[PDB]
Amino acid sequence: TTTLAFRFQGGIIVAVDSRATAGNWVASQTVKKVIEINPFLLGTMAGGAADCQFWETWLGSQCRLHELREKERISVAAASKILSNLVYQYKGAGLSMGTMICGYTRKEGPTIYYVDSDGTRLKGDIFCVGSGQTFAYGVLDSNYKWDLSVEDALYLGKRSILAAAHRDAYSGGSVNLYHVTEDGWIYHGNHDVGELFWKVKEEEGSFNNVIG
Amino acid sequence: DRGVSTFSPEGRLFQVEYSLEAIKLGSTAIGIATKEGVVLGVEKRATSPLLESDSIEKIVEIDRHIGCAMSGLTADARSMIEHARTAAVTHNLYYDEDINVESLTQSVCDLALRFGELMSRPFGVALLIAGHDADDGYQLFHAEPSGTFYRYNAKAIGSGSEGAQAELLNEWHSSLTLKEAELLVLKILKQVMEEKLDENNAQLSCITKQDGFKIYDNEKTAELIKELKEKEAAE
Amino acid sequence: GSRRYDSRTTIFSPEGRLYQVEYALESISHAGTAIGIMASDGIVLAAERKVTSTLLEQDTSTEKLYKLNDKIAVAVAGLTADAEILINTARIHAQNYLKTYNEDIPVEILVRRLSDIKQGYTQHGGLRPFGVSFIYAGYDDRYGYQLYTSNPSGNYTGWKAISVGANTSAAQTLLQMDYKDDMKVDDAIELALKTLSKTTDSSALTYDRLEFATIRKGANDGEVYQKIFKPQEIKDILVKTGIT
Amino acid sequence: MDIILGIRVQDSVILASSKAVTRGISVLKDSDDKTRQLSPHTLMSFAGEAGDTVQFAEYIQANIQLYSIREDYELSPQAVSSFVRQELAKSIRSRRPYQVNVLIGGYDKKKNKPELYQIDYLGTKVELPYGAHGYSGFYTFSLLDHHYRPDMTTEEGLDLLKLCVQELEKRMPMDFKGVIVKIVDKDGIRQVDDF
Amino acid sequence: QFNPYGDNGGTILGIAGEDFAVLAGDTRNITDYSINSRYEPKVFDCGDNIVMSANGFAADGDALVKRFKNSVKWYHFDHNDKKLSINSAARNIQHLLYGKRFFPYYVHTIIAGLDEDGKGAVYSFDPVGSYEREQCRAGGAAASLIMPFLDNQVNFKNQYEPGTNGKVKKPLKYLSVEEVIKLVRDSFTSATERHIQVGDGLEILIVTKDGVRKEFYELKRD
Amino acid sequence: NNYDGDTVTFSPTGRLFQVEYALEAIKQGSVTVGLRSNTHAVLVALKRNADELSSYQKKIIKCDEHMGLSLAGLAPDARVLSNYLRQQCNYSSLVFNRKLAVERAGHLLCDKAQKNTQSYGGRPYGVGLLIIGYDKSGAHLLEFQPSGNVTELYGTAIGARSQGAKTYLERTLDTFIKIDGNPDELIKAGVEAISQSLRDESLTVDNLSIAIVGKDTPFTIYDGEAVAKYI
Amino acid sequence: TQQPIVTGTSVISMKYDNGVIIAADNLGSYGSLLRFNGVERLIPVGDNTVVGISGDISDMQHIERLLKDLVTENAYDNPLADAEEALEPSYIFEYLATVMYQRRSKMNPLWNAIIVAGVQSNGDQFLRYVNLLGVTYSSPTLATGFGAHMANPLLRKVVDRESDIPKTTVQVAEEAIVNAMRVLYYRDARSSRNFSLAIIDKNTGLTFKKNLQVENMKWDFAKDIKGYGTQKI
Amino acid sequence: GYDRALSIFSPDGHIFQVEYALEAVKRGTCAVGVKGKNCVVLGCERRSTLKLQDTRITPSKVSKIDSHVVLSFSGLNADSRILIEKARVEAQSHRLTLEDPVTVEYLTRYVAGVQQRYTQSGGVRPFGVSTLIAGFDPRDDEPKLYQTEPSGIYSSWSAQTIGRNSKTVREFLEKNYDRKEPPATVEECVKLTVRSLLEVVQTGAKNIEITVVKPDSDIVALSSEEINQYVTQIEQEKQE
Numbered sequence A: 001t002t003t004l005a006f007r008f009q010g011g012i013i014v015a016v017d018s019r020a021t022a023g024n025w026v027a028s029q030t031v032k033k034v035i036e037i038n039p040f041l042l043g044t045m046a047g048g049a050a051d052c053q054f055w056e057t058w059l060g061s062q063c064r065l066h067e068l069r070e071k072e073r074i075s076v077a078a079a080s081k082i083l084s085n086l087v088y089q090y091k092g093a094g095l096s097m098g099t100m101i102c103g104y105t106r107k108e109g110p111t112i113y114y115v116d117s118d119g120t121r122l123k124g125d126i127f128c129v130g131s132g133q134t135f136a137y138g139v140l141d142s143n144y145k146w147d148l149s150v151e152d153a154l155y156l157g158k159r160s161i162l163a164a165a166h167r168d169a170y171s172g173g174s175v176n177l178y179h180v181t182e183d184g185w186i187y188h189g190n191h192d193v194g195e196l197f198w199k200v201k202e203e204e205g206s207f208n209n210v211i212g
Numbered sequence B: 001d002r003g004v005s006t007f008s009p010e011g012r013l014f015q016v017e018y019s020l021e022a023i024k025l026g027s028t029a030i031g032i033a034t035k036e037g038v039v040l041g042v043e044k045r046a047t048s049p050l051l052e053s054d055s056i057e058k059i060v061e062i063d064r065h066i067g068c069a070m071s072g073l074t075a076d077a078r079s080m081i082e083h084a085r086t087a088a089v090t091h092n093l094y095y096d097e098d099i100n101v102e103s104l105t106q107s108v109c110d111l112a113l114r115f116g117e118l119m120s121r122p123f124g125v126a127l128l129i130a131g132h133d134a135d136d137g138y139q140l141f142h143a144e145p146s147g148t149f150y151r152y153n154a155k156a157i158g159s160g161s162e163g164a165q166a167e168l169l170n171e172w173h174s175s176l177t178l179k180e181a182e183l184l185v186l187k188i189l190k191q192v193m194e195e196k197l198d199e200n201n202a203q204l205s206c207i208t209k210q211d212g213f214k215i216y217d218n219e220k221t222a223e224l225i226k227e228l229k230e231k232e233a234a235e
Numbered sequence C: 001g002s003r004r005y006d007s008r009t010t011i012f013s014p015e016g017r018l019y020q021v022e023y024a025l026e027s028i029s030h031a032g033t034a035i036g037i038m039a040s041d042g043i044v045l046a047a048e049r050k051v052t053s054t055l056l057e058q059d060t061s062t063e064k065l066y067k068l069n070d071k072i073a074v075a076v077a078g079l080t081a082d083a084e085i086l087i088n089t090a091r092i093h094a095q096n097y098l099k100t101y102n103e104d105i106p107v108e109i110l111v112r113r114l115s116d117i118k119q120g121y122t123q124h125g126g127l128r129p130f131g132v133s134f135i136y137a138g139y140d141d142r143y144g145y146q147l148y149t150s151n152p153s154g155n156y157t158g159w160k161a162i163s164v165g166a167n168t169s170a171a172q173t174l175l176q177m178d179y180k181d182d183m184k185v186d187d188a189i190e191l192a193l194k195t196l197s198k199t200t201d202s203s204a205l206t207y208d209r210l211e212f213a214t215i216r217k218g219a220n221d222g223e224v225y226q227k228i229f230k231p232q233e234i235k236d237i238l239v240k241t242g243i244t
Numbered sequence D: 001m002d003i004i005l006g007i008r009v010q011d012s013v014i015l016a017s018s019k020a021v022t023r024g025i026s027v028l029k030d031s032d033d034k035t036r037q038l039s040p041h042t043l044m045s046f047a048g049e050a051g052d053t054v055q056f057a058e059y060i061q062a063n064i065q066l067y068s069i070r071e072d073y074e075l076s077p078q079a080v081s082s083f084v085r086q087e088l089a090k091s092i093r094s095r096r097p098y099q100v101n102v103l104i105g106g107y108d109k110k111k112n113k114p115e116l117y118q119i120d121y122l123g124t125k126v127e128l129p130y131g132a133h134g135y136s137g138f139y140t141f142s143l144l145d146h147h148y149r150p151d152m153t154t155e156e157g158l159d160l161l162k163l164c165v166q167e168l169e170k171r172m173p174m175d176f177k178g179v180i181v182k183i184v185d186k187d188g189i190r191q192v193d194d195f
Numbered sequence E: 001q002f003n004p005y006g007d008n009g010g011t012i013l014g015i016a017g018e019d020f021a022v023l024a025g026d027t028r029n030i031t032d033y034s035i036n037s038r039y040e041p042k043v044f045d046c047g048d049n050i051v052m053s054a055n056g057f058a059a060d061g062d063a064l065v066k067r068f069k070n071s072v073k074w075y076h077f078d079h080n081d082k083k084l085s086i087n088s089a090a091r092n093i094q095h096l097l098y099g100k101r102f103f104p105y106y107v108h109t110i111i112a113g114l115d116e117d118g119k120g121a122v123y124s125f126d127p128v129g130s131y132e133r134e135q136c137r138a139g140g141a142a143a144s145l146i147m148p149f150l151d152n153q154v155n156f157k158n159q160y161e162p163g164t165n166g167k168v169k170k171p172l173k174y175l176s177v178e179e180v181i182k183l184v185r186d187s188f189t190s191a192t193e194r195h196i197q198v199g200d201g202l203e204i205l206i207v208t209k210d211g212v213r214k215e216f217y218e219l220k221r222d
Numbered sequence F: 001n002n003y004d005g006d007t008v009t010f011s012p013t014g015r016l017f018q019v020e021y022a023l024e025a026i027k028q029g030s031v032t033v034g035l036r037s038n039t040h041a042v043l044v045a046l047k048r049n050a051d052e053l054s055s056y057q058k059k060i061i062k063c064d065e066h067m068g069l070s071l072a073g074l075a076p077d078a079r080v081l082s083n084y085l086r087q088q089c090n091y092s093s094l095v096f097n098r099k100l101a102v103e104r105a106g107h108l109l110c111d112k113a114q115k116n117t118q119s120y121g122g123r124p125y126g127v128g129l130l131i132i133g134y135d136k137s138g139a140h141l142l143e144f145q146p147s148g149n150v151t152e153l154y155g156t157a158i159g160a161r162s163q164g165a166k167t168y169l170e171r172t173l174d175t176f177i178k179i180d181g182n183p184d185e186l187i188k189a190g191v192e193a194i195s196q197s198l199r200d201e202s203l204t205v206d207n208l209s210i211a212i213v214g215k216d217t218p219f220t221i222y223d224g225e226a227v228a229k230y231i
Numbered sequence G: 001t002q003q004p005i006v007t008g009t010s011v012i013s014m015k016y017d018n019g020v021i022i023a024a025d026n027l028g029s030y031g032s033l034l035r036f037n038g039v040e041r042l043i044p045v046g047d048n049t050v051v052g053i054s055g056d057i058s059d060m061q062h063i064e065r066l067l068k069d070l071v072t073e074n075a076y077d078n079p080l081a082d083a084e085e086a087l088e089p090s091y092i093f094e095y096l097a098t099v100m101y102q103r104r105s106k107m108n109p110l111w112n113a114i115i116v117a118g119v120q121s122n123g124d125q126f127l128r129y130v131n132l133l134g135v136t137y138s139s140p141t142l143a144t145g146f147g148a149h150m151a152n153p154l155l156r157k158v159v160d161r162e163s164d165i166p167k168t169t170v171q172v173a174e175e176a177i178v179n180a181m182r183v184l185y186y187r188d189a190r191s192s193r194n195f196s197l198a199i200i201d202k203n204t205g206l207t208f209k210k211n212l213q214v215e216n217m218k219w220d221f222a223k224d225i226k227g228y229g230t231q232k233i
Numbered sequence H: 001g002y003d004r005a006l007s008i009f010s011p012d013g014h015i016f017q018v019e020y021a022l023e024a025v026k027r028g029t030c031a032v033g034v035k036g037k038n039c040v041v042l043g044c045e046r047r048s049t050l051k052l053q054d055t056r057i058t059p060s061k062v063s064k065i066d067s068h069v070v071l072s073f074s075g076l077n078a079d080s081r082i083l084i085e086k087a088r089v090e091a092q093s094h095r096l097t098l099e100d101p102v103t104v105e106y107l108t109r110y111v112a113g114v115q116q117r118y119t120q121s122g123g124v125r126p127f128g129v130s131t132l133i134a135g136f137d138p139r140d141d142e143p144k145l146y147q148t149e150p151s152g153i154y155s156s157w158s159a160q161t162i163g164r165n166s167k168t169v170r171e172f173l174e175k176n177y178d179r180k181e182p183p184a185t186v187e188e189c190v191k192l193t194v195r196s197l198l199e200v201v202q203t204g205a206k207n208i209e210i211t212v213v214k215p216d217s218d219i220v221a222l223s224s225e226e227i228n229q230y231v232t233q234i235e236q237e238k239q240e
Ligand SMILES: *C[C@@](C)(O)[C@](*)(O)[C@H](CC(C)C)NC(=O)[C@H](Cc1ccccc1)NC(=O)[C@H](CC(C)C)NC(=O)[C@H](CCc1ccccc1)NC(=O)CN1CCOCC1
Pocket: A001, A002, A019, A020, A021, A022, A023, A025, A027, A028, A031, A033, A045, A046, A047, A048, A049, A050, A052, A096, A130, A131, A132, A170, A171, E101, E104, E126, E127, E128, E130
């Protein structure tokens, strides 16, 4: 899978691919790897499909219970730590999860937390997760600056997933884009790689390795 | 002494009947159901003027589509609310949908008779559970410590209940608007309350399909109190 | 069923008192007097034995003064068997703390733990409370010399001088009269024995009636020594102070 | 987590801990602080298996902070190190042990002395003038055996630490992305922002 | 050593139309190179206009269907005879499957029916309960043979408008029930030719607003 | 008197007063009627309201496709016992692929109620039940009392003023037993029977509750305008 | 987890127009040793059901006791125990299938393959299989072990599909079963000559046949077989 | 285990064990809480029947739950320790999982929930304790003061008192405390707290304890001499 999230001047960009595999069998090209926990919180999924879907859906329930009890939106820190403490209980049992918890709150500002199934929890500005993470990192790190336009940042996230979809055999299908602000997350569409690749090739003049 | 789960010669559980007496001593809570929404209002009843009245939380959210008002030993309600919230969220987790208002009420009422020699006594609090679902629409339920619940078009509980219920008998009709129901709760609360009704010692709330469960601001309730005074003076 | 025979040992009276705690305190008021006095250079523990018989083997006997560790001792007033249950628990707690932190347990932490055990018997479990009051005499490097007392309620407080058991009202008045803050161990020894000598229900105070102990930072090269007095040594200090 | 170093000088304890967090093929982060303040004059650095390290460190932190509130008093470094050791010695015979190695650097306010304790995942405790966990010590102990004196200043301790880090940057295969350095003395804990 | 799992073969197929849905499965049941039965029903009417099949290890499949059927019964009891929607059924099945995360049900599950807007719905599950709604899904032994064909013929993948160079895709359409059944029959005839574990018979359950209808067709018995 | 403090105590004349006090809670409950022919079995229940603003308390509960009951007394106890019946019906289906016999269902309820009458701490159930069903030996009607006593009957009634309906059925016995292959006439006889237990109040549209089970008829409950036909 | 010790081989069965037939040999093998020669592996339950069991014999004897106890339990507080509330083949099967799957799910199976043969109340033929894994299936013919490989092909020539069942008489069906048992004696190394056969008919009831033998065997051609290729004498 | 229902309803709808626990609170030494504009002050009575005490080591009446929240009480002293310990544990547990210290309202709600649980659990009696919980939420400058009681009800107070003769001091505070303009400074708030205790205490400065809590974990306990200066100034103004 390839998933990424990064912080910049205008908030957070989150982009993921849509492929599910069973070994070399391509099980699906239409999976949703972003979960919308609330209007200010997003979760990304990489690893076991069931593990990710079940526990991130469960996380949504625990975040909802927090706001009923405390009359206040859960912090990104607290939400990420609920998931990391849960997987830590299951450590050694064989769960497979690589996730990013991305959101805005007034007290924290825009925040990204990496959480995985061996128990690691890390705050940071940039993360790429999954089988195709290295390919995304290659494009992302070279064109990254703090002060991209929202338009340029959305494109870079889209382009980094495209890069990984191309090179990584276990990533592909389509690109789902999100932008997180003060006012919440905004969906910026599903982009099929079968059309996007050729569009990007022509307009950008990239992918000169391919017969086009 | 005597068993906690003992029947009286009339065929009633002593402890359940005695808990109903505790509920009569509690502050008044009123609920009115309409086709435009369900309104829930309470008497706050601060024991002293130094007590910051906004911290009196007798109206409570269970889910976005289900609200709750209480009367009696209000400390006992916290674990009931916690169960209701968990039951509502858990059902959404298992079934990807809102939980029915009746089913939620039934879950709360299953706790009630779990007492013996489990908890050591029944709950000393009654609840008005108000909500909306797609199947049966806008609903109001009265949940007792007996484990029984009744659906109501309108219902009062607490110290002024029998006086308030007789008034709700005359005033309620099937064509009531939401604005009309708000004023009607404020009217009946003002009638049964010891102290003079204002925005600081009484609280309104409602549940609509569009906006869900909302506790009203003190500024919003103040305007509805001013609107009530003028319309009563009008004839 | 069994409900019929339950005394209900952990309930409030209408006045907001714990019946069994109050009645346990009444039991303790008949027990032999124990006095603790804290000085600048040490602590004294003095206590009166209850069972005067010429045939009691005194030199091997211990009803009042018990050692908890090298730094902390207790004087008992109440049921001796109840006290020994608590004493052994306190000895274990001290060694658990030493094992964990590699430092001797601070006096207050030991006192709080025992006092919490007593509290539990008043709030849950349906058992009778322990019919014991302790005077704790101890030293640590934070607060130095400390005197505490605990009673069956589980409440504890700190003291410069204190009495428990019989005639505490009379004893506490006499201590309040003659105690001063700049006082020393030798003076506190004399005060403890004089207070028992006046409050005692017996005709005269003798060596065979007393258990006596001191905790001094007057050991060789700045250490703390616990001295549990032998019968002959109690007899000598009675002659020295001028009581016999 | 890779490199954690400690050095006890005249009037302070200095802890240096690497910034890299690496999972398999990728360096996920290059600014990771591998330490927790246990009390105002006691700092614990840590390294070992992913997840276990932070979970253990924060668990110890919570317990020492609980003790501090209850007694209104700061435990000595020796007492904190003995508590930590017992937790690890208990852990090693569990269903799933904590795979975490730690250094505890503290300033004892009673004795007016810096103290450095090295404890491994088995619960093996030693007090040392200088310490390291993992492959670091294979390079750094020989250096410190040559250059260390007990009466060194904090500035001399930092220079001696630069000489350790330079050697590790020259000879170790992994890029550990530099170190965060923290000093523990009579005035508390502070971070050296430029290293 | 005792192996608690087995492989009973078989293949299943769900296709969603505009106002209908089908769930088809072959009726052959096998172990190794033996045929256990030529007609052992694998697709089941579970009530509330929902059809289900859990293909793979038949004992786990039967157990799961049995537990879901029971879940529908208790959903009626506990929520005033309310109709279990297909989306709600799917989430319930995820919890049934993930409940045995560390000793899984060795099956690939497909359910079919109508959503709350009356439109055709097919949901698909992995052994430990990850799920997704789709227009198309095949599961089981010959899934690898059938799915690419469905991508091509149901979702019109790799097909373009003639004369547009290759820039206008074939536009997506809902298929009629007659057209879907033709694709189902050809899928299973093709799978039977090339997969040894597929054959004997084809049983199709069709779900509309009017209810659940059945159709049966012979397949090759070799 | 001195022997009614708990369920574990016999009185000097061999009586269990707590059980008898539980039996009293049934007599305070609203009336419900049960009757059957050879083909069908019918429950008819008079539902009770708190006041004019309130709903009418539901009296009939479905246990399986072929079995269900009506209640009189403490409704939460009917919920506990009906849930137990639902589970036992369900166990029979899942393990033995067998619809639970109505006679065996009665035996299970009896034994569940009994345990509460012999042990300390617990209390008897405060509710009476009329179980109807259609199984492999045809139509059945049972009466459950929380003493543990379960009885198979052609017809009966329980609750307040239930003696009136019970006498009518005792006269009508020879007529209504013969109503085979005619559900509407069997319900008519049940509605006419429950009418003998009414005083002051009469059968309105949201007051009446009817249920039926039979040969080619699943257990179904009729409320609201569905029972206007029979008023 | 265990291993089977004393074992029984094939159980074979089929439906015919008015009922079902089931058969199994009387052997309990101890690996290659043909240890016990008088073991009954068809166990009747009432007058309408026969349970045929292969695999571990200790586990078979356990199952036999469960079924015996099931009859006792069904009679309790049941005035119609010998009539409308008698045990059915479908009830007996579902019970065993539940037990088998529960035991495999605890990683402690009953190491058997079971065929429940019978006739229901309404006259319908019942024939269904269950094994140590809890796997279940029904077919006009059913067989365990070697019988699956050798008996089913022969029995399927008589009843190839559902529509062939009314066309098959009891004489034809029994003949096919008896021939199949002979073929298994020729070819299964853990079989015996002696066997038991049970017919459950909707009209004539349960007929249980003991001490049957495989007969009309062909061995005469053996005299003409010499060497393994080139040997002439 | 001992399962006996000690807290039960009586015919008039009262739970006597809960009401008798309030009587234990009535017996306890007086405690008072007053919140200013930028502070909260907790005043406590020390009964002077006990002299020859060691004031260094005797359990102080105000207890820190965390660095930013304090708890005082009236009632059984031994019972109060159990609530304080549980509250301290929960404060650290909240920091561990939420990565944020407790709000004053949250800590109050927890302590109150423990008190409630002991009114409907078998084999236990209610706590003979009412608490005043005071402090400042993290990164917040608005003062917080809450009260709990044996039943488990809790609420927020501009000012409040509990314990023996609390009726008298509540009377004083109801006329002297203005909501529109509270004690603007630390001095004004401490003075009003000492004044209110001087209505009941009937002795100089050894019987009064004061603890001032300010924003950002700034908690300090006043000494005897500092309090004695307030006592001197109040009575010199009173002589007029
Ligand atoms: C694409 C990516 C790089 O792998 C990315 O991480 C995605 C992210 C998901 C979609 C959120 N991950 C997957 O696609 C996983 C990869 C993976 C597989 C197995 C274990 C861990 C990770 N894919 C799945 O989880 C897969 C989704 C299905 C195909 C829709 N499910 C399985 O492979 C499934 C369950 C595996 C399993 C079993 C027991 C415990 C835990 C996990 N296995 C099968 O269906 C087995 N087999 C049956 C016959 O057909 C082939 C597959």
